[PDB]
A = this chain, B = another copy of it.
Amino acid sequence: AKGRTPRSFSQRYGKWNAKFTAFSNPTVASTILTNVAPIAQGNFQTNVPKFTSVNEQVSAVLTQYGVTGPSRAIYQGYGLKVARALNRIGAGPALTNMVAGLKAYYVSAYGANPEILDAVTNIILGSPTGY
């Protein structure tokens, strides 16, 4: 019962502004954040290492291909994207379909190199295709 009726700009803005003005009260924000602190810490500790390690391995791979500067971010980004998929749906044919989709995305929108995308996918999933 959250997205059942259409909400126009006026309604979205009104409700967003009401909730923002409410969260800016000292007691409201303090209470909410102090109560959600341990769960947030647990979620960070559960999820972030899988992505920090991907950062480190993709850095190792990018240094061997001579990629420097902001052009590194491209492949770093792609790697993180793949890791997200592996975290969300697991390994299997769906992950293969998403890896192909992500490679097409990056190659045709951002001019990424298919060879370095294969190298990143190999360091993350074990195979260039990911089977």
Contact = CB atoms under 8 A, between A and B. Distances in A.
Contact of A91 (B29, B36, B63): B63
A36 to B, nearest CB: 5
B64 A38 contact: no
A72 B21 CA distance: 32
A110 B15 CA distance: 30
Interface residues of A, number: 97
Contact of A53 (B26, B32, B50): B50
Copy number in the complex reads 10
A126 B72 CA distance: 17
A81 to B, nearest CB: 10
A68 B98 contact: yes
21 contacts: A5-B88, A9-B45, A10-B49, A11-B42, A18-B35, A22-B32, A24-B37, A26-B29, A29-B30, A50-B56, A57-B126, A63-B95, A64-B94, A66-B93, A68-B97, A70-B77, A71-B71, A91-B91, A101-B110, A104-B107, A123-B126
